[PDB]
């Protein structure tokens, strides 16, 4: 199975099969799995919670809606001592989008710095152009609250 | 077979469910639910379009550690409500696991005590009864919250 990639402390990214290995996630301390898909089956691991963000890897779909509620869940899981695994089918677009959204919202990065952080961990990271624009709107809105 | 209705309102933007809420997609949409909290290892949730689902994987068993999941669970629920949505917490019987999560959330994010939070749950769902293990964990949670 492909490894999990540690994006940042208590933050992991993976492809779909990487979320199936119960032993990796236990090794990584993963307590919450964010499954950014509509069909991929998520963790079976005893005691690993799962949040499903149901989107196709598709510039039409509205991933912007789910960012703030998904990020709140993840930050809570980390502040309580756990860690998060964000996965999609390829570990390239949807999971990349949520990870950078998390880093902007809770680690106070700009979209550029945050995404450079995801890329360094995961070179193939590439949100489709629709998501990439939704993340700029997230940044816009974050700036205005901040 | 589980006690009806499928959905009960426990508090503004907070609904409890039994298994029969798995086929109540229309009632969900009425109630503007934007997040389902499935508190089971094995139960299915409603297939509500683009509604997020959080699974809190525990059996209705006094040895299951629900306490460990309350913070990300309660945090997801609040963020959905703060965003203007509603939450549906559902378990198979709508009695133990979903009740205890509803109690927890009220304590954590609406500052209610454990006497008042559970009262609201029981009052909306008269059969509600977390198993003794879940009740101990809830008691433990109220102490952690009164200290913090
Ligand atoms: Cl900044
Ligand atoms: Cl890019
Ligand atoms: Cl179950």
Residue numbers in the entry:
A (entry chain B): 16 to 161
B (entry chain A): 13 to 160
Give the published text:
Dual-specificity phosphatases (DUSPs), which are known to remove a phosphate group from both phosphotyrosine and phosphoserine/threonine, constitute a large subfamily of PTPs. DUSP28, also known as VHP, is a member of the subfamily of atypical DUSPs and contains a single catalytic domain, whose precise biological functions and enzymatic characteristics are largely unknown. The DUSP28 monomer adopts a canonical DUSP fold composed of the core region (β1–β5 and α2–α5) and two mid-domain variations: α1' and α1. To the authors' surprise, DUSP28 has an only partially exposed active site pocket and exceptionally low phosphatase activity, which together differentiate this protein from other DUSPs.
To verify whether substitution of Tyr102 with a canonical histidine residue can cause structural changes to DUSP28 and improve its phosphatase activity, a mutant DUSP28 protein containing the Tyr102His mutation, referred to as DUSP28(Y102H), was prepared and subjected to crystallization. We obtained DUSP28(Y102H) crystals in the nearly the same condition to that of DUSP28 crystals, and its structure was finally determined to 2.4 Å resolution. Although the crystal structure of DUSP28(Y102H) was fairly well matched to that of DUSP28 when superimposed, with an RMSD of 0.50 Å over 147 aligned residues, the Tyr102His substitution was revealed to result in noticeable conformational change of residues Ala33−Ala34 and Gly57−Pro61. These residues are in contact with Tyr102 in the original crystal structure, clearly supporting the structural role of Tyr102 in sustaining the DUSP28 protein fold. The phosphatase activity of DUSP28 was rather reduced by the Tyr102His mutation, in contrast to the introduction of the Asn105Ala and Arg107Val double-mutation, which considerably improved the enzymatic activity irrespective of the presence of Tyr102. In conclusion, DUSP28 contains a tyrosine instead of histidine at the position ahead of the active site residue, and this tyrosine may play a structural role. On the other hand, this substitution may not be the key determinant of the atypically low activity of DUSP28.
